[PDB]
Amino acid sequence: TDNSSPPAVPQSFQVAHLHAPTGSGKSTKVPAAYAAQGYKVLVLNPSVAATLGFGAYMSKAHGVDPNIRTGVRTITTGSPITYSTYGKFLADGGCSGGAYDIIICDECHSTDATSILGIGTVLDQAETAGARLVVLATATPPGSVTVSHPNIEEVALSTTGEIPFYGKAIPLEVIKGGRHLIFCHSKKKCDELAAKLINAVAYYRGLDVSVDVVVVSTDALMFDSVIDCNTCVTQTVDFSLDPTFTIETTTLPQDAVSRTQRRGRTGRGKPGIYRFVAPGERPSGMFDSSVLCECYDAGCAWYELMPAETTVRLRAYMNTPGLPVCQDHLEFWEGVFTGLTHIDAHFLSQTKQSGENFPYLVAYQATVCARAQAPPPSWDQMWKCLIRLKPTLHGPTPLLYRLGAVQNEVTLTHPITKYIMTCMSADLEV
Amino acid sequence: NSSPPAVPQSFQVAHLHAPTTKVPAAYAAQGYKVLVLNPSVAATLGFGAYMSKAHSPITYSTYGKFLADGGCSGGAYDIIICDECHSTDATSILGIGTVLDQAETAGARLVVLATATPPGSVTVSHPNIEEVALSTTGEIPFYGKAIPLEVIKGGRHLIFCHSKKKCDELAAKLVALGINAVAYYRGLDVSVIPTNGDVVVVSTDALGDFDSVIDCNTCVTQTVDFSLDPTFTIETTTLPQDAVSRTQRRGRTGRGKPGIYRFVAPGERPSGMFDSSVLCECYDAGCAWYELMPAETTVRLRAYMNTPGLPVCQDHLEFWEGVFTGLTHIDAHFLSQTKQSGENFPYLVAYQATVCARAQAPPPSWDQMWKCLIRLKPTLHGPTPLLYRLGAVQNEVTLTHPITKYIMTCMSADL
Ligand SMILES: COc1ccc([N+](=O)[O-])cc1Cn1cc(CC(=O)O)c2ccccc21
Ligand SMILES: [Ca+2]
Ligand SMILES: [Ca+2]
Numbered sequence: 001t002d003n004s005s006p007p008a009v010p011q012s013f014q015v016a017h018l019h020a021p022t023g024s025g026k027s028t029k030v031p032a033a034y035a036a037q038g039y040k041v042l043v044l045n046p047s048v049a050a051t052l053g054f055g056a057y058m059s060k061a062h063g064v065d066p067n068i069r070t071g072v073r074t075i076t077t078g079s080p081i082t083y084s085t086y087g088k089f090l091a092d093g094g095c096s097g098g099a100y101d102i103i104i105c106d107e108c109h110s111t112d113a114t115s116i117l118g119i120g121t122v123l124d125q126a127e128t129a130g131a132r133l134v135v136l137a138t139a140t141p142p143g144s145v146t147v148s149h150p151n152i153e154e155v156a157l158s159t160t161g162e163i164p165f166y167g168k169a170i171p172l173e174v175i176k177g178g179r180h181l182i183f184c185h186s187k188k189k190c191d192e193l194a195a196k197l198i199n200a201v202a203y204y205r206g207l208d209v210s211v212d213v214v215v216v217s218t219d220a221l222m223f224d225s226v227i228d229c230n231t232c233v234t235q236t237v238d239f240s241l242d243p244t245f246t247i248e249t250t251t252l253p254q255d256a257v258s259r260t261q262r263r264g265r266t267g268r269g270k271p272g273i274y275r276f277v278a279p280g281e282r283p284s285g286m287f288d289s290s291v292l293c294e295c296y297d298a299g300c301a302w303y304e305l306m307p308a309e310t311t312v313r314l315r316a317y318m319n320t321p322g323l324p325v326c327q328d329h330l331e332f333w334e335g336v337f338t339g340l341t342h343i344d345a346h347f348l349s350q351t352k353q354s355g356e357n358f359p360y361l362v363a364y365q366a367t368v369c370a371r372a373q374a375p376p377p378s379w380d381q382m383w384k385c386l387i388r389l390k391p392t393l394h395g396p397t398p399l400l401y402r403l404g405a406v407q408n409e410v411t412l413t414h415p416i417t418k419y420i421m422t423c424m425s426a427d428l429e430v
Numbered sequence: 431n432s433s434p435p436a437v438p439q440s441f442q443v444a445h446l447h448a449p450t451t452k453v454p455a456a457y458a459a460q461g462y463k464v465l466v467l468n469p470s471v472a473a474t475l476g477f478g479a480y481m482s483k484a485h486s487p488i489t490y491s492t493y494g495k496f497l498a499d500g501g502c503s504g505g506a507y508d509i510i511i512c513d514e515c516h517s518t519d520a521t522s523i524l525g526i527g528t529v530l531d532q533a534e535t536a537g538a539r540l541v542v543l544a545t546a547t548p549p550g551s552v553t554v555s556h557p558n559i560e561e562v563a564l565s566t567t568g569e570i571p572f573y574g575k576a577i578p579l580e581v582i583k584g585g586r587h588l589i590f591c592h593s594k595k596k597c598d599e600l601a602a603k604l605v606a607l608g609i610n611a612v613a614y615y616r617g618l619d620v621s622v623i624p625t626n627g628d629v630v631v632v633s634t635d636a637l638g639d640f641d642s643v644i645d646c647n648t649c650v651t652q653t654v655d656f657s658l659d660p661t662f663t664i665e666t667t668t669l670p671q672d673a674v675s676r677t678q679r680r681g682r683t684g685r686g687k688p689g690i691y692r693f694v695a696p697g698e699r700p701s702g703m704f705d706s707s708v709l710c711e712c713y714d715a716g717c718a719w720y721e722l723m724p725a726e727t728t729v730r731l732r733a734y735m736n737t738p739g740l741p742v743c744q745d746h747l748e749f750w751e752g753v754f755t756g757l758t759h760i761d762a763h764f765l766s767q768t769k770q771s772g773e774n775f776p777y778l779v780a781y782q783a784t785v786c787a788r789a790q791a792p793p794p795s796w797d798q799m800w801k802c803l804i805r806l807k808p809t810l811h812g813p814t815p816l817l818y819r820l821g822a823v824q825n826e827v828t829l830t831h832p833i834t835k836y837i838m839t840c841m842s843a844d845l
Contacts, residue, residue: 143673143700145550156736167745238655253703253742256550278735280742283550283700286670318695319563325670325697328574429668430593430650 002322006030007135009039009102013127017322018104018137026137027054027106032064035080039101042082044089044118046110048072049222051083086110086118090303094121095129102133109138109257111287111324113294117303117310120317142285142324146259149274152267153225157275163196166229166277174275177212178224183262185231185251190216219258225273226266230254230281235357237290239428243412244420246402247290247358255282289329294358296337301352301360307337332427339419340364350385358403365400368416372398378407435542437462437509441534445739446511446544451481453544454511458487462508462539466490467525469517493517493525497720501528502536509540516545516674518704518741520711524720524727527734549702549741553677559684561691564644570603573646573694579607581642581692587630589644590679592668594634596646601632635675642690643683647671647698652774654707656845660829661837663819664707664775672699706744713754714777718769724751749844756836757781767802775820782817785831789815795824 001007007016020026027043027050034041045051048070055068058081068075069084071091082100084092095103103126105119119136126134161169174180176198184190190202194216201210203217215221219232232254238246254262259281266272295314299305305313311334318328343360344367351359351366366385369376373394376383382404386392398414399406434453435444437460446453454464464487471481471490481490489507491499502510510533512526526543533541568576577589582604591597594615604611612621614633623629624638631637635649649671655663671679676698683689712731716722722730728751734740735747760777761784768776768783783802786793792810793800799821803809813828817837 142697143550143552145702167748240657251744253744278742278745279738280549280702280735280740282742283702285700321696323697325695325699327668327670328695331574429648430595430666 006033007133009034009037009133011132013132013134015123015134015136015320017141018135019141020137020139022139026139027104028057028062030135030137031081031104032058032062034102035064038080040080040082040099041102041104042084042089042100043104043106044084044086044122045106046086046112046115047107048085050107051085051088054083085114087114087302089118090114090121090298095125095131098130100129100131102135103131104135104137106137108136109140109142109144109284109324111291111326113291113298116287116291116317116324117295117298117313119323120313120315123320124313124316136320136322140257140260140284141322142283144256144284146256146263146281149263149267151269151271152263153271153273154263155273155275156279157277165227166231168277170227170275174225174273175214175227179212180214180225180227181221181223181265182214182216182227184216184218184229185233187218190218219262221265223266223272225275226263228254228259228262228274228276230259230276230278232258234288235290236288237293239424240402241421241424242402243399243417244401244424247293247361248402253278253280253282255286256284285324287324287326289327289333292326292329292333293336293361296333297358297360300337300340301348301363307334310334329428332423335423335427336420339416339423343367344370347385354384356382361401361403365403368398368400368414372414374398374411375408377403377410378405380404380407435540437540439539441539443530443541443543443737445548446542447548448544448546450546453542454488454509457509462487463506464488464509464511465507466511466513467493467496467529468513469493469519469522493522497521497525497528500720502532502538505537507536507538509542510538511542511544513544515543516547516549516551516701516741518708520708520715523704523708523734523741524712524715524730526740527730527732530737531730531733543737543739547674547677547701548739549700551673551701552698553673553680556680556684556691559680559689559691561680561693563696564692564694569607570600572600572644573648575694577644577692579609581690582609582630582644584628585641586626586628586638587642587644588637588640588682589630589632589646591632591634591646592648592650597632597634601630604630604632635679637682639685640683640689641687642692643680644692645671645676645679645694647676647693647695649675651705652707653705654710656841657819658838658841659819660816660834661818661841664710664778664821665819670695670697670699673701702741704741704743706746706750709743709746709750710778711775713750714775717754717757718765718777724754727751727754746845749840752840752844753837756833756840760784761787764802768799771799771801773799778818778820782820785815785817785833789831791815791828792825794819794827795822797821 002017004020031041031043051070055066058064058066065077066079067077067082069088071088103122157168161171163170187204190204194200194202200214203221205220231251233249234252236250240246263274296307296310299310311330314330343364347363347366351363356362373392374397375392376386377397396409396411399410400417431447454466457464510529512529564575566576568578570577597613601611601613609630610628611630614637616636648668650666650668653667655665657663680691713727716727728747731747760781764780764783768780773779779799790809791812791814793803794814813826815831816827817834
């Protein structure tokens with residue numbers, strides 16, 4: 001059941017789509033109104049700062065002290081309103097019997113691994129746990145394109161101008177001076193776009209913050225004008241058959257959510273300017289198979305889910321209409337992780353702690369290397385859990401799959417490598 | 431936007447989001463010479479008169495012919511309607527881009543970018559077509575779901591599979607269960623039974639009318655991979671169908687009589703995006719067919735990309751312009767042969783053949799696209815100097831050709 005207004009609570013279980021503008025209190029006004037009717041309500045967000053910031057707002061302005069549930073900080077007050085991150089909801093085990101009448105999946109357009117595994121978990125479990133209503137809330141449903149902003153200047157940036165931007169040319173005036181934000185697809189391009197620059201400072205993170213100025217930043221940032229390269233760097237899987245698959249990055253046209261949010265960081269009350277390298281954009285609503293791979297990695301590394309349980313939750317996500325779509329590779333990734341047995345627990349513990357991208361994949365490749373007394377695929381910091389070059393310098397690397405640049409010599413005959421190749425044959429089409 | 435643009439007083443580019451011929455009629459009625467461009471001027475139904483049939487102030491042609499005719503001429507038209515402007519085939523993209531680069535200098539007052547599927551469109555309900563998700567319950571396995579034999583036992587049915595291989599296997603298992611199943615794909619003709627007898631057609635999109643459609647909701651598309659082995663790879667990937675594909679497949683049921691649509695996946699790719707390989711096709715076709723310098727091709731593609739509301743692509747224009755600019759002294763006779771045979775990248779195939787011929791080396795494989803080299807006893811004599819991969823390689827390769835080093839450098843500096 002799709003709509004622009006807060007769907008009333010049905011007598012029996014339903015999943016409803018809520019498509020409403022961002023500030024219009026989908027995360028605050030909607031849960032409060034459900035609560036004023038006497039319902040216990042859960043509000044899920046991808047962001048820890050958002051989660052923490054909703055709790056804050058409702059206290060400052062509203063005299064309501066919600067339960068707040070994040071990895072870093074958990075507060076229990078007994079309020080009918082709970083705010084939680086998707087990831088903390090997953091750690092809590094998902095839906096616990098009878099706890100909530102309503103579950104709002106906020107920003108349900110998010111395609112990060114936890115949002116998708118989280119939403120999938122709600123859709124698989126909410127009815128059984130006694131929820132009456134699941135609400136799938138976003139401002140930007142699948143298919144969305146960016147629209148006119150009343151209070152934002154948008155004028156095409158042309159050939160003529162004095163700086164090398166992105167095949168186009170911003171002309172002096174516009175960043176001298178005042179406060180200006182400039183988006184680039186990469187860290188490197190940030191650090192020496194600014195080096196060329198008028199006051200200017202680069203952000204992408206590792207860094208904290210550094211608030212007349214010109215900021216040159218990736219999207220890692222959480223303003224008179226915005227300057228937009230209109231492109232983003234995205235993680236994709238390549239089924240490279242060398243021997244198996246590769247996790248790499250690709251530079252794509254930004255999609256609608258990207259373009260709106262980048263533009264959105266100007267013109268907040270004060271009329272602001274948006275300028276661009278390129279007019280068009282990807283519509284919102286697609287994500288990559290590498291995100292499914294992330295989901296299984298996280299189930300295994302963080303949430304103690306057998307691959308087959310993760311599948312059940314992600315299957316719930318894919319059978320649900322009006323959500324971002326991706327290749328159906330559930331069988332394949334399930335097969336892959338299911339064959340990854342007896343990981344070395346200490347290596348897993350380190351890769352998780354170290355914040356690597358696929359800590360299960362990293363720790364498992366390191367496990368194979370240790371047990372074959374072979375070196376990691378490179379001596380990149382990804383593999384530092386093997387600092388102990390000395391015995392495991394014995395020869396070529398038994399290469400399960402590609403997570404980064406590979407520097408060592410490699411061997412492609414390890415049974416796990418052959419196991420994954422067989423899974424590729426079994427589960428991937430044409 | 432939803433109504434036909436009034437003709438503006440100076441040159442402008444308008445968008446027409448029409449719903450699911452009336453339009454260029456209106457314009458002509460006011461004395462304006464109207465040119466309408468579509469991918470094809472065949473009848474939409476596949477049955478009926480050509481759009482170009484006489485009985486003018488209204489010409490109907492194709493992007494293909496328009497490009498072959500060399501584009502806009504002089505002062506032939508007041509209004510150019512680029513119809514079906516969601517099309518992301520190379521010919522439509524170079525054609526539209528050509529209209530936009532040239533129309534104003536040709537004295538048109540208006541260009542209309544018309545489509546029923548603007549970028550971001552999803553498919554909408556159909557009053558005449560009931561949709562029912564496939565479950566995992568059923569005797570016939572179908573893309574992770576199952577078809578119950580009941581819903582195709584008797585009656586007439588269309589099942590879409592993404593590949594010809596998949597069509598044959600499914601049809602074979604249907605026959606082994608007593609169903610009248612024919613497979614269809616590019617290369618077959620008559621085998622579909624028009625006689626209202628029971629039948630299930632298992633086909634690709636190569637494809638009477640049907641009680642139901644069953645859709646794998648996947649498709650195959652061309653992509654470029656920047657694979658560094660040594661340079662790039664034109665390949666094919668399997669993707670979730672987009673909205674025009676879904677709408678179109680579902681649309682082969684429920685015409686007149688009500689119909690059923692059964693699916694594997696409830697959702698789609700949104701329309702409005704295409705691959706960098708399409709750019710590559712455009713430069714290939716610019717050099718092979720239209721006598722276009724690479725920079726002239728850039729100029730037409732650039733005008734496309736500066737136009738809002740159009741399908742979006744990676745901006746690899748400088749990259750592709752750079753590689754084709756480097757492809758010098760192609761053997762003219764190989765070029766003729768690759769053009770005539772209908773290879774997909776006739777310039778690239780023939781250029782690779784040319785570099786093989788000069789270096790007296792074999793082609794990457796002996797699949798049919800390399801047949802201009804059949805004069806062979808000299809030329810199977812060492813490694814293949816591989817410029818790029820246009821298909822499966824079989825031969826030993828060398829990476830040491832200048833042009834290979836050249837393309838590699840374009841990849842590093844432009845991408
Ligand atoms: C840092 O932990 C990560 C990191 C990445 C991902 N992920 O898959 O995207 C998932 C997790 C797991 N995770 C993510 C969260 C979200 C949060 O920190 O509130 C969380 C909370 C408690 C316990 C585990 C939690
Ligand atoms: Ca590849
Ligand atoms: Ca690749």
